[PDB]
């Protein structure tokens, strides 16, 4: 442990205190799965989503900036997975939506085969055109691409 | 083991395609060292068949013939692997598209309920065969289409007809006593019985994949590869794969393909014009067409119609100067002036004008493709793809348009939200997720922002 | 290197004439039209080579007897009864003919393969002489534009 | 020139209304505003 965790009892020796799987002076990687594998992501992602939503909807507030600068680390970690879209809400107002993006989904969309299809799809709706079919063509492209990645998961 | 082999063959499809291209090039390079024997072979003497066709006499080597044999066998094997990889990888996308189209046609338009399409749309007619099968939503991952069509069309058209058409004939699916709960499955490893397969769906899928054009091309590749063993010169037909194996080469050939519809019409006009010139020549200038050598020979001439037409189409277009280069000169004849206008008009209309159109269509195709790419680039740089507000409004804040395109409205984010909605159980949908999911089910697309955005509605300072 | 080789042989000073290409802005503008699509010009030449190769394959298999370039018959018959010889024959004479390969072969005067040879010559002329050179001459114009 | 003429007429039709010539920017404030204006309010078939 030399990279990031500093040498204090609250930081470094806390890990050794938690690591008590066996008394044979040995440790296994099963602790990694047992603790902070599922729950780390499961609660930290919701906490980050709450903080991002509050920061976005509460601008020009001094109190929230302290929480932002303290949770900078977890927000930087959760930036790749956190997503933002905008929809027409049920109250006829524009509302933002936050959800979770899996790592395999972000990996497959970066592959050249998928990126080539995106370039060709944009080349078609611009030339052929559309006034109401445009959103229909966009969703049709999305569903066809989603099948490609889910099939690509079966390597 | 079979599943792992199929996955391996599906992963490296383009790799085996390019490797087949390379081995085809190698075989064709080997083919450049052929020869034909001579010296009055055992066949008796102008012999009927003393051909002694071919041999592969090398330049101080003896490795070429076994190399050709093993490369032919290897090419056939690799191409079979290419077919297997295509069926493993790209067929499911086609089947998914077809299933999606027919499912939405049934659920929204009633193609086989209230429409009954006519003799046209043969693909749509063939799509009627998959309606009554058991495993209809095999790839569309929407298994509720058969149940949900009843709530829309059952009352107005009768339960019995739709139930018979779709194929789940049962009164109320109500079990009586344990409904044959569970037992050991007859199917197992080492091919125990393996009979739970829908022959109807398999035949429909086979028809779709046997009508697919890329699969047709791969089947032709198969036929040429296996014919290459019957005659090794048939391996030359595999050189055409470079046209569809390279993006730059596809770009080059798209210039011809763009106006190939009009090139053939131009050639037809050339044929018609040459025919009219042959009519005039046959009627009037028949005596000039004496191609016999030095006069005192049996006079071969085009004193016919088909002969004269083939003469004009063969020599007269390929002359660079028209037909006047290949006819006797009009040295002091009563038709000298008329023949002069004949030759000059033929040259100026066939050689100069029509070939100019043929060579100008390609240039216009190049220009049109370049302009199309410029237009799509300018559209992407000018307006947002989702709301189409325009960069002028967003650029008030520094990098406003880039922020809007990257964070607020993003194609990747809108694509990932669909996967998130699909792979989540309806019990765990929040209010917004359910509101979007319902409108996705009913295909409204009104939740996509249009003419509005978060900044447009709520300014950063509340307005 | 060329300047010092010019003392060994004074004809090597001719290689220094190419400096005009990079010494003049207008001349650079002229040559940039070719340079813009030089990546695709070589691919077009490669397509020409492949098409000529296919035509040589067909000619070697079927129309071998027509390729007798020997003079006035009663001479030692020089002909392209090979593969590399026929391919070099087609690439040398047949592209530089203005009318395809039919200008340099014996005419099909009353033969069973007359129609097939006619389609052979016409297709060769219409695909090699007319279409490919049109692409070569259109790439430059597109570069200018 | 013929291709450019066809492109110009297509762009003019896609940009401005044939009757009033207001422009799609004003109408597109409401969703599908220009399409509504071209189909319902100002229509060549209706005026014929
Ligand atoms: Zn936008
Ligand atoms: Zn109007």
Swiss-Prot record, chain A:
Tissue: Highly expressed in heart, lung, cerebellum and brain. Detected at lower levels in adrenal gland, stomach, thymus, esophagus and ovary.
Superkingdom of the source species: Eukaryota
PTM comment text: Channel activity is modulated by phosphorylation. Phosphorylation is increased in failing heart, leading to calcium leaks and increased cytoplasmic Ca(2+) levels.
Knockout or disruption consequences: Embryonically lethal. Embryos die at about 10 dpc, due to defects in heart tube development. Cardiac myotubes display enlarged rough endoplasmic reticulum and cytoplasmic vesicles that contain high levels of Ca(2+).
Cell compartments where the protein resides: Sarcoplasmic reticulum membrane
Domain notes for this protein: The calcium release channel activity resides in the C-terminal region while the remaining part of the protein resides in the cytoplasm.
Subunit organization: Homotetramer. Can also form heterotetramers with RYR1 and RYR3. Interacts with CALM and S100A1; these interactions regulate channel activity. Identified in a complex composed of RYR2, FKBP1B, PKA catalytic subunit, PRKAR2A, AKAP6, and the protein phosphatases PP2A and PP1. Interacts directly with FKBP1B, PKA, PP1 and PP2A. Interacts with FKBP1A and FKBP1B; these interactions may stabilize the channel in its closed state and prevent Ca(2+) leaks. Interacts with SELENON. Identified in a complex, composed of FSD2, CMYA5 and RYR2.
Family stated for the protein in its record: Belongs to the ryanodine receptor (TC 1.A.3.1) family. RYR2 subfamily.
Function: Cytosolic calcium-activated calcium channel that mediates the release of Ca(2+) from the sarcoplasmic reticulum into the cytosol and thereby plays a key role in triggering cardiac muscle contraction. Aberrant channel activation can lead to cardiac arrhythmia. In cardiac myocytes, calcium release is triggered by increased Ca(2+) cytosolic levels due to activation of the L-type calcium channel CACNA1C. The calcium channel activity is modulated by formation of heterotetramers with RYR3. Required for cellular calcium ion homeostasis. Required for embryonic heart development.
Protein name listed in UniProt: Ryanodine receptor 2
Gene: Ryr2
First and last residues shown, out of full length: 4051 to 4205 of 4966
